């Protein structure tokens with residue numbers, strides 16, 4: 001689709017069989033999701049947001065559908081204010097910014 | 100232009116007579132710029148995300164040139180680690196997300 005920006009670009013994602021709402025976020029390098037259960041091992045990551053740095057859990061090679069598009073990649077789990085789809089997965093779905 | 104998302108979508112802006120580099124950020128409702136002086140009245144606001152909140156000064160009716168396109172709107176000024184062009188100005192330059 002072509003998504004204008006008068007409203008927040010919220011989409012439905014599917015991860016671990018569950019539907020969640022998430023924000024398409026070109027200002028995020030990484031995809032960050034609220035606390036949930038994911039399979040496999042995780043590794044630590046420090047990410048720096050508007051308010052400072054936080055620790056999150058990094059899960060790699062996670063299957064995730066974004067607005068109906070299949071992606072497989074890194075998902076960070078931690079205390080984010082909203083689920084954000086960052087550029088690591090926006091690139092997988094072929095998203096560009098245009099003006 | 101069409102901007103791919105392999106790297107941060109950084110553009111040059113002009114604000115208050117100064118050139119700065121800023122992120123085109125679909126995940127931000129509003130535009131947030133590092134500390135600088137702007138003309139006119141302002142009021143304080145708290146904005147929050149990953150890592151918590153920061154206090155900013157809200158200036159209304161500020162003109163920015165974003166990658167050569169002029170737009171006017173509210174600009175928040177404070178200790179953000181990155182300059183952020185949010186939806187309030189992305190709409191004005193006709194920016195869309197496409198996939």
Ligand SMILES: CC(C)CN(C[C@@H](O)[C@H](Cc1ccccc1)NC(=O)O[C@H]1CO[C@H]2OCC[C@H]21)S(=O)(=O)c1ccc2c(c1)C(=O)O[B-]2(O)O
Pocket residue numbers: 023025026027028029030031032047048049050081082084086124126127128129130131145146147148149175180181183185
């Ligand atoms: C969290 C999101 C819903 C909202 N933000 C935009 C988001 O795009 C940030 C933009 C940003 C980019 C670099 C550094 C700091 C901030 N990205 C981000 O945190 O990305 C993380 C995930 O990947 C990592 O890569 C980049 C950092 C890491 S915000 O900045 O917190 C933000 C922007 C505007 C407003 C508010 C909060 C608010 O409350 O009112 B407001 O005036 O509307």
Ligand SMILES: [Cl-]
Pocket residue numbers: 044055
């Ligand atoms: Cl840890």
Ligand SMILES: [Cl-]
Pocket residue numbers: 072073074088089
């Ligand atoms: Cl990835």
Ligand SMILES: [Cl-]
Pocket residue numbers: 171172173187188
């Ligand atoms: Cl505005």
Ligand code: NA
Pocket residue numbers: 138139140158159160161
């Ligand atoms: Na003003």
